[PDB]
Amino acid sequence: SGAIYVGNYRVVNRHLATHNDWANLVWEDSSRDLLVSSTTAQGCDTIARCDCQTGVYYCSSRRKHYPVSFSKPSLIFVEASEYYPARYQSHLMLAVGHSEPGDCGGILRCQHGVVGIVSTGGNGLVGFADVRDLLWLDEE
């Protein structure tokens, strides 16, 4: 589990979105596994605006933050998980690391702020849903 709180936005994995998230929906995209809902309270997370490929992510299944190199946000074939079939997922970045379903929502951060959240796992890779192209999170 986990979310990003930026401005009056809450960013979660689409597959973990709550009724309240859907009842306050701003934007959602199944192909990215992202959903954004509106918040009453100001969030303080800063979204990275950069093309970093090194950062640190939180892995709830190990109670650890791991430094990782990660790939460029891309359209990748993801094998079936407990929450999605085998499919193509867009705006996805991979690293070598541990990721189990419960780890979805863990933050990947770089020197510029939050890069994205854990979205995929398996076969020794961790996949992150990028948010750095969502420039509107910074405004409105």
Per CB under 5 A, does 110 bind Zn ion?
Answer: yes
Largest CA distance in the chain: 40
Q: Is 44 a catalytic residue?
A: no
CB of 14: closest distance to Zn ion in angstroms?
A: 24
Answer positive or negative: Cα dihedral of 46, 47, 51, 57.
Answer: positive
CB of 64: closest distance to Zn ion in angstroms?
A: 21
User: How many chain residues are in contact with Zn ion, going by CB under 5 A?
Assistant: 5
Per CB under 5 A, does 76 bind Zn ion?
Answer: no
28 token code pair = 């959602």
Per CB under 5 A, does 17 bind Zn ion?
Answer: no
Q: Are 34 and 28 in contact (CB under 8 A)?
A: yes
Rounded to an integer, what distance in angstroms lies between the CA atom of residue 57 and that of residue 59?
A: 6
Catalytic option among 45, 103, 104, 130: 104
Per CB under 5 A, does 135 bind Zn ion?
Answer: no
CB of 112: closest distance to Zn ion in angstroms?
A: 3
DSSP-based three-state secondary structure for 97: coil
The strand pairing partners of 128, in sequence order, are 93, 118
Annotated binding site for Zn(2+): 50, 52, 110, 112
Binding residues for Zn ion (CB under 5 A): 48, 50, 52, 110, 112
**Catalytically annotated residues:** 15, 33, 104
